[PDB]
Amino acid sequence: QDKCKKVYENYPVSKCQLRIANQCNYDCKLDKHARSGECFYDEKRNLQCICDYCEY
């Protein structure tokens, strides 16, 4: 596990860092229907909404 995911460049990095209101994980499953959804930094130290694609 933890080997499949999908970055969502079409998402505000602000809402991601929002530990109080992470609309990222909620957004992913909303449309993408990912597993849980989470935000993480990229090669360029850019926090993006990375969704999980593997299960239902």
Swiss-Prot record:
Disulfide bond annotation, renumbered to this chain: 4-54, 16-39, 24-49, 28-51
Gene Ontology biological-process annotations: defense response to bacterium; defense response to fungus; killing of cells of another organism
SUPFAM superfamilies: Scorpion toxin-like
Any single Gene Ontology cellular-component annotation: extracellular region
Keywords: Antibiotic, Antimicrobial, Disulfide bond, Fungicide, Pyrrolidone carboxylic acid, Secreted, Taste-modifying protein
Pyrrolidone carboxylic acid: modified positions: 1
Function recorded in the entry: Taste-modifying protein; sweet-tasting. It is 2000 sweeter than sucrose on a molar basis.
Family: Belongs to the DEFL family.
Assembly and interaction partners: Monomer.
Protein name: Defensin-like protein
